[PDB]
Symmetry: D2
Subunit: 120 residues, 4 copies
């Protein structure tokens, strides 16, 4: 449903190394849509690993808007692994929590799509 | 200094709480441009606070493309604080869109040029003083 | 072998909640022993989760000594999950392995201490 | 004030490089004492940088005990910078961070850190 989806934008290395390395990428979701606002934003940073068991392996930082007095506890950290179900990255991915990451990788390095979190 | 400029894109909370809280935001740079490619990407996550000396306080994650055997050491973590220079150091009387929008510098001397849009987008250019 | 063993010390919550929650803990290794010195230290922060397949799930920060010009790239971050080889005190006490093949030997004491030895498969 | 202090233990590089690099260290506090229990633990990882304005610069991870369903939101991250009141002798003493929290530490000759922590926030 519309209510559960949030806009994402990011960037990826559109000319990765050819030495066996992964493809670096990152993206952001701000947790506001027309339905809800959690006053927070998550960024995922990680890499795409191609081949027989393709994955996007990430670490993330989730910052909430806080008063100055609460800033010390503004940021959560964690790690999400995505499995699928430029060409490599583009498609629909799910993580270990059941969240859905729908993304288009542009030839130029853009990532654009939607994120639906299974948790809140 | 074209060789040292990179595209950025991100998101922010375009309707922040009115309980005195900051405004959550984040953005990404992939470290490839038409001249150079570090095979890496940084994301910054943090919050904007307006006022007399506008500030964006962030933590960041810098992931390099690695082999699977080196993946354990793929990700650096750190923290940058940005202060505003253009159009001024102050948020200047406008909301989070206007307060965020402009040119900023961090403690390393890197330059963050950003335009914040009414429906949550951040679009700009980043230049790093280190790397 | 000896060359790859390092002293570890840490703390845990010796009176965790009895509401389905895990048990908070953390520990430190400085990567100096009598055979080598990497001029760095890792801390692991996480929780012990009990049951038929007990787990210690952690995130870590590995800081190297750097010059001030390189301090921006001093700290790696990552995550290790430990499973046990062969109360929270008894739960944590023993020998553990992570997804890298590293070995974690620890005694958790009634007063909240963690004392042991770490061997890294990649460090 | 016993009621506001928590036991810490950690390790540090007791033979750092002599090339101007800082001294790596880390420590842990479990947030349980005889008076209070937050069911959480913080680890600080960082480096001591000596000189006339010595500092211990850290990043930290604060993990709370959670149910499995809440584990995704178990761990806070941040950064504290410590200044010393008035590298073994370097580290040993009393330090305060930007929040006014107090870090009291003895550095042992072979790499141990032992002391107390008091947080000005909670
Ligand atoms: O609670 C909030 O402030 C907004 C929702 C955050 C959901 C987080 S983002 C990191 C993690 N991975 C997911 O798929 N969901 C959670
Ligand atoms: O070395 C790389 O892989 C690319 C350059 C990274 C520069 C980093 S991003 C985090 C920190 N903040 C800056 O302004 N620059 C450094
Ligand atoms: O390279 C170094 O500076 C020291 C060795 C570090 C090994 C790290 S600690 C985090 C991760 N978990 C392990 O078991 N090994 C690596
Ligand atoms: O809230 C808790 O779970 C226990 C107190 C945590 C206080 C934290 S530790 C990191 C940061 N630095 C401080 O000096 N205090 C806060």
């Amino acid at each position: 449903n519309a209510e559960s989806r949030y806009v994402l934008t990011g960037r990826y290395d559109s000319a990765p190394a050819t030495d066996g390395s992964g493809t670096a990428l990152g993206w952001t979701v701000a947790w506001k849509n027309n339905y809800r606002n959690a006053h927070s934003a998550t960024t995922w940073s990680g890499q795409y690993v191609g081949g027989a068991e393709a994955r996007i392996n990430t670490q993330w930082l989730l910052t909430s808007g806080t008063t100055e007095a609460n800033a010390w506890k503004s940021t959560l950290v964690g790690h999400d692994t995505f499995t699928k179900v430029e060409a490599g990255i583009t498609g629909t991915w799910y993580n270990q929590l059941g969240s859905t990451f729908i993304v288009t990788a542009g030839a130029d390095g853009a990532l654009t799509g939607t994120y639906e979190s299974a948790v809140g």
